[PDB]
Amino acid sequence: GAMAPSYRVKRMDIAKNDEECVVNAANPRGLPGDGVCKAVYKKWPESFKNSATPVGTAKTVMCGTYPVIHAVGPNFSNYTESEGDRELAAAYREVAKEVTRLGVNSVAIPLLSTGVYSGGKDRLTQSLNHLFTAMDSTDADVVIYCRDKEWEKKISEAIQMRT
Ligand SMILES: [Cl-]
Ligand SMILES: [Cl-]
Ligand SMILES: [Cl-]
C-alpha cells in the first residue's frame, strides 16, 4: 500500500504516467481504438494480446512486468442513461479488484466513458464519482489523467473538496 493513500490529477498523456500500472479506456474487442486507447496501444502494444472483455469488466495483460488494466466503459450512444450508469459503476469496481490483486502502490486512471463513449454529454462528475466509489477502499496512490484545462480544474476541486 501507499504510506498515505492520495488522489491527484495531471493534464498530460497517460502513456507518460509515473505510476506502477495503467488503466486503459478500452473497447470490448481489444482493438487499438482512439484517444486514450490508441496512446495505450502505441506505448504497450504487447498488452493487447487477448485483451477483449465485455462492457462493465476489466482484464489485465502484462507488457513485460508492467500491468495494463483494460477497463471497458459503456458507450452512452448505445446504452440507456440507467443501464449505462450501472455498467460505468461496474467497470470501476472491476478496476479496484485488479489494482488490489496486483499489489501495486500506485495506478494511472483516465475518466471512463467521458470521450467518444459519452454520447455527446459532459460526464466528468458522473464518471469521477464512480471512480471514487470504487477506489476509496483501495490503498494505492491514484493519479487521474485528463487533457482539457477546465476538466483539470474541476477534477482538482472535487479531490480537494473531500479534503
Ligand atoms: Cl503530454
Ligand atoms: Cl471514452
Ligand atoms: Cl479531458
Swiss-Prot record:
ADP-D-ribose binds at D13, N27, G35, G115, V116, Y117. Residues 4-163 form the Macro domain. In the N-terminus, the macro domain displays a mono-ADP-ribosylhydrolase activity. The central part called, the alphavirus unique domain (AUD) has a zinc-binding function. The C-terminus region, also called hypervariable domain (HVD), is mainly disordered and binds several host proteins. This intrinsically disordered domain contains 2 SH3 domain-binding sites and 2 FGDF motifs necessary and sufficient for the formation of nsP3/G3BP complexes. This is Non-structural protein 3. It is a peripheral membrane protein. It comes from Chikungunya virus (strain S27-African prototype). The chain holds residues 1334 to 1493 of 2474 of the full protein. Seems to be essential for minus-strand RNAs and subgenomic 26S mRNAs synthesis. Displays mono-ADP-ribosylhydrolase activity. ADP-ribosylation is a post-translational modification that controls various processes of the host cell and the virus probably needs to revert it for optimal viral replication. Binds proteins of G3BP family and sequesters them into the viral RNA replication complexes thereby inhibiting the formation of host stress granules on viral mRNAs. Interacts with mRNA-capping enzyme nsP1. Interacts (via C-terminus) with host G3BP1; this interaction inhibits the formation of host stress granules on viral mRNAs and the nsp3-G3BP1 complexes bind viral RNAs and probably orchestrate the assembly of viral replication complexes. Interacts (via C-terminus) with host G3BP2; this interaction inhibits the formation of host stress granules on viral mRNAs and the nsp3-G3BP2 complexes bind viral RNAs and probably orchestrate the assembly of viral replication complexes. Interacts (via C-terminus) with host NAP1L1. Changing V36A: Partial loss of mono-ADP-ribosylhydrolase activity. It is found in: Host cytoplasmic vesicle membrane. Phosphorylated by host on serines and threonines.
